[PDB]
Design a protein around this nucleic acid. Structure first.
Length: 364
RNA sequence: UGUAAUA
């Protein structure tokens, strides 16, 4: 029926929003002899409806398919048409597919810069950017930008994150937490810093959040942050370290934090200033865990923190002055655990603790 | 004995 019609006589808008018309057009695009011509005819007729098709249940398939065939000039004009609408497109079920494919097949920087302009405050508010980051459909467009574009383009993402308390809105959200991690994994160091300042400022709102705890831990894996983050975290948490060790989500961060102190000092046998404060903080921690040993060994979450501190496998090579202050105050904590060991017979993890006191002796 | 991620 439609196959018997000359391409020049096709009603491309009509076909584009139809499942079979759109599929017919796609197959025509995959047909080398007719690919170029069907593209150029289709293009001129559908260009006033670029936004419409991008959002269309079937049209979004055509737009995507077209991205593999459009000239640079054709794709540029397409982006010039719809860049102000990037918010609307990104939250859209079908629009998100179209935009990802467009972003994924940019030909040059002129096209990239247009998209970025769309995400700037001239067309998309900070609040809207935040919405996209947490949105079911939008977070995929943000991730696309994050993995396709140079970090020199990340301005609009950064601005939205550091705005007031948006670090909480983003970090404590199922989707935003993921995006932020993707961002941090590719960010420039100076961008990581700007976000880190905001994370530390709102640490209590993140440290024990179901998703926020993951952000803190992620930050702890970035080595270029050691020179300040270890002291910063601990100075903001020390007075409530026992509390945080006894909470579901923050207990993992304390464990992560403690293992990092061990890994840094052991590896010394990483820059020098870090080693200095790490030694100091570790000792203070043992003091804190010693004082509160009554609660930590008894807590449903705290015992994990304690066990991490006590595990000799973490600190074998530590067995100048510090290597003797540790051996004293951790050895002292070891014997103190023994005294309480009978007072927790009923618990499921007594034998796990008993093995650690046992493995202490074998290397002592 | 304890946490996440389109026909």
């Amino acid at each position: 029926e439609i196959s018997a019609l000359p391409l020049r006589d096709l009603d491309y808008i009509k076909l584009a929003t139809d499942q079979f018309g759109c599929r017919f057009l796609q197959k025509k695009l995959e047909t080398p002899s007719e690919s170029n011509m069907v593209r150029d005819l289709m293009y001129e007729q559908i260009k006033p409806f670029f936004l419409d098709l991008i959002l269309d249940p079937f049209g979004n398939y055509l737009v995507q398919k077209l991205c593999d065939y459009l000239t640079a000039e054709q794709k540029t004009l397409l982006i010039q048409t719809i860049y102000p609408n990037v918010f609307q497109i990104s939250i859209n079920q079908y629009g998100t597919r179209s935009l990802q494919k467009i972003i994924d097949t940019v030909d040059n920087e002129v096209q990239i810069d247009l998209i970025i302009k769309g995400f700037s405050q001239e067309f998309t508010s900070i609040e809207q950017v935040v919405t996209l980051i947490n949105d079911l459909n939008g977070n995929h467009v943000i991730q696309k930008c994050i993995f396709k574009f140079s970090p020199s383009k990340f301005g609009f993402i950064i601005d939205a994150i550091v705005e007031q308390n948006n670090i909480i809105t983003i970090s404590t959200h199922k989707h935003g937490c993921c995006v932020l991690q993707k961002l941090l994994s590719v960010c420039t160091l100076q961008q990581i810093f700007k976000i880190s300042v905001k994370i530390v400022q709102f640490l209590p709102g993140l440290i024990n959040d179901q998703f926020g705890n993951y952000i803190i831990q992620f930050l702890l894996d970035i080595k270029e942050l050691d020179f300040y983050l270890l002291a910063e975290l601990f100075n903001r948490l020390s007075n409530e370290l026992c509390q945080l060790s006894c909470l579901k989500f923050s207990s993992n961060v304390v464990e992560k934090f403690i293992k990092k102190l061990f890994r840094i000092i052991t590896g010394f046998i990483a820059s020098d200033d870090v080693i200095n404060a790490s030694m100091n903080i570790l000792l203070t921690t043992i003091d804190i865990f010693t004082v509160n040993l009554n609660v930590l060994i008894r807590d449903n979450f705290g015992n994990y923190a304690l066990q991490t501190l006590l595990d000799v496998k973490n600190y074998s090579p530590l067995l100048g002055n510090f290597c003797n202050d540790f051996s004293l105050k951790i050895g002292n904590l070891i014997v103190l655990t023994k005294e309480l060991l009978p007072s927790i017979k009923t618990t499921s993890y007594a034998k796990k603790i008993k093995l650690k006191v046992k493995a202490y002796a074998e290397a002592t």
